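[SOLVED] Need 3D model of a five-part complex

Original post:
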Amino acid sequence: DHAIYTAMGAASQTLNQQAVTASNLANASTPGFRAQLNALRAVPVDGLSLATRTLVTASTPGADMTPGQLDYTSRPLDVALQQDGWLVVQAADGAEGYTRNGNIQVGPTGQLTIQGHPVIGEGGPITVPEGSEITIAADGTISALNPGDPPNTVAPVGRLKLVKAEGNEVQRSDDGLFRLTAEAQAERGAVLAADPSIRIMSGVLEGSNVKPVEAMTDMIANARRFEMQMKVITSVDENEGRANQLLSM
Amino acid sequence: DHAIYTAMGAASQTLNQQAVTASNLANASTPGFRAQLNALRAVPVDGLSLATRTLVTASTPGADMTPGQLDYTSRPLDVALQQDGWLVVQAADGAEGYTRNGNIQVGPTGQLTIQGHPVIGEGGPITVPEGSEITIAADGTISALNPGDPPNTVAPVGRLKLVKAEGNEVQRSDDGLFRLTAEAQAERGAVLAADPSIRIMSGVLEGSNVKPVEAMTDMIANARRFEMQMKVITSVDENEGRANQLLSM
Amino acid sequence: MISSLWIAKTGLDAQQTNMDVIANNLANVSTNGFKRQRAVFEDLLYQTIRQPGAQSSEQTTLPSGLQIGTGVRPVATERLHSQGNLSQTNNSKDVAIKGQGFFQVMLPDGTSAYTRDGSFQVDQNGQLVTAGGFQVQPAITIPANALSITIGRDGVVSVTQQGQAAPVQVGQLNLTTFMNDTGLESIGENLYIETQSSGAPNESTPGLNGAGLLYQGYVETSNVNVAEELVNMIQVQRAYEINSKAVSTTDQMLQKLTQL
Amino acid sequence: GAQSSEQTTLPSGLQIGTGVRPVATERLHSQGNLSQTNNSKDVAIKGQGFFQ
Amino acid sequence: IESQAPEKLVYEPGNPLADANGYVKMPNVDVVGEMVNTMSASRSYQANIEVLNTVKSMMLKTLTLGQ
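Solution:
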């Protein structure tokens, strides 16, 4: 009779996986979105005799660190990072989260903000003169020009800090912002170094790295597995109803 | 045994949701129609021990005040309101209903009548000279040029009153016309002011905001929920029937 | 309704909104001064369900926790403010802008709107208007019987009269610039209104303090790249189909579940 | 019910409604274009009017 | 008691009941778990009913002890 619960787990966990891919698959055309690859973990239930039951918990071993491909927007301060490079952003609470969205914006007061909770580079928040005409250089140096001054007055006004950290040492943190896995902190410290090898492209955005082929095959497999567990549940229940008749007379 | 009632409730109320969606969904291509969004309310059954049951009562919290999308018809007196705007109309019983249908019409005797029960503006029902040749301006003024007079005689003949009100402070009134909620009446009064900042888009109509996407999953979830309720009912009755053997013998 | 259904419907909503943005951005080719819109989406919060354990590093262990997350709410519709191409209209009372700036217009209700459109005219009293009669602030009143109207590169507008060998300077047509051009709240009729995301308007003559010059007889065209819109349309249709497949797969899962 | 406004509450009542009955088939009287038939007995109209 | 799982959210920032960061609260009921609970509860109910019948026969037969 307890077999049903094992099957039940799988079904529920399968639904959980579906949810993952859904939030994975709806986020196509999200700038810089990193897909959330999913897995199923076997959980043996070691006990007192003849361990036959194992449960089917679901999991997200992290995010897919595969760089999505680029849209040339020609916008002066759309920034695209090279592979395994991250923009640093002051998060909501105030902390260095990491992002791949280069859709930079400038507020009316001269504040450079990938979507609010702004950006961090070489100091605190990056602030630029109000008459922006901003350009972002190849290695991040931010140069500015007042729109009504001669072009030979474009001295740099800031620097855009970039960070190398990939995969096993990066963890999503309930926002679009990643952080360090608390295991890569008895390591390279809480606030990371600037890694003077991460390059930038201006005028290019990076899109979601959601491969639709693996998503589609994932959904197919999920549907089939769900309905297989459904058969197991039906058979077990019908067995139980069949067998409660030992006790009569 | 009383569980069946709760399940019945759900099933019954789900049908009501279906009904709403159907009326919500047949009314695509109805001019200026406001989709009647719907929700399900949990209803606990506070009692003398073990508060375990809750009902599933169906409800319509209000209408979707999301501006439907505009159709350009170039007809001189087809009106489209800006967001959160309403045309005021003398209802059947006589009271200022509010509509988004700008399909204005003129009778032979010069009564401006959004589908009859005429329109109200700056006084009683708006009246125009019989040879109307109406034009409607951006802020609501209505000018009339008799067909056989020099065109520099387009002196304004009226003004179309418009009102700002949306969502929480407006409810449907068993006709296509909306009114204030009687919670927004110890507030901006029984008859609202003209709000001389609501603009008119002339020659353009507004269609219904019936979102087919959310309606299609409304219906999918409704069907699934219904047949889950049927499974619960089946198990409950089979339980009771097989139980009834206790009392005999 | 289970979470997969609602997440996939957020995805379908997002693709529908993106298609609305594309369709508007497409239909407004041959709209003067129109600035292309780009839909920017953002993911919603992730609900951690089971925090990741300890990575003992004794073996290569998968870092499995479980956070699902949801939704694709549209976060912005950025107006891509760039200098569009010029087209000659041969109309004397017409003008385009060389660089940033907006003509200030007095709305019917009293406030000020701002337009990047030079389809100007004159009403019966000589006042400049904007294709719909909205007065261009500050008012410029052209004399009754001018031989010709000239609007210079810095807005100094003059008229030539019968007999005098001098273009009497009849008005000044000054521009308005914002510290954040993107933040202007579009209202229709080719009009933007200033909001907290754009800052106060800064008034100035063209060519000074960052305002762009003026080119008479030309109209700025929409900076819509139709090839981009077509490629985005293909992407939107495919993503819509994929999300519909997600909904359908979940629905047949549910059918089988409720069978028994 | 009443919006007690102590807490943000859904304004839930219930009305179902029905139907999309056709209420009109309007006729849009805008001037159409003209075609030359070279036919002397043919005639077109400039503006509002009808032949009795 | 109540199942204190974190009450899965949805986004409808025009709906009342949505806080800052408009996020309706949307009960966290897992339908598969609840259907399995209903099935298992019905089966256990049947087993106990049918234990009761067996025991009732047992006792009514005990009353005929001897005579």
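Edit: The two ends of chain D are 60 Å apart (CA to CA).
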